[PDB]
Each structure stands twice: as structure tokens, then as C-alpha cells.
């Protein structure tokens with residue numbers, strides 16, 4: 001009705017992908033991109 005229904009939005013700008021669970025996003029990057037390294 002009238003209430004900001006929480007909803008996180010994480011997108012791998014790098015590959016313009018989408019991951020429901022952020023935890024996966026991080027693992028996906030360090031696995032594919034791995035820029036930090």
C-alpha cells in the first residue's frame with residue numbers, strides 16, 4: 001500500500017549482470033573480473 005518495501009539492487013556494472021544475493025556478486029567478480037587483484 002503506502003510503505004517503502006525494502007529491495008536491494010545489485011548489478012555487475014562490469015558485465016552489466018544481475019545477482020539476487022549480493023554474496024554471489026562478490027564471488028562472481030573476484031572469480032571473473034577480480035579487479036582488486
Ligand SMILES: [Zn+2]
Pocket residue numbers: 012014015016017028029032033
Ligand atoms: Zn561481472
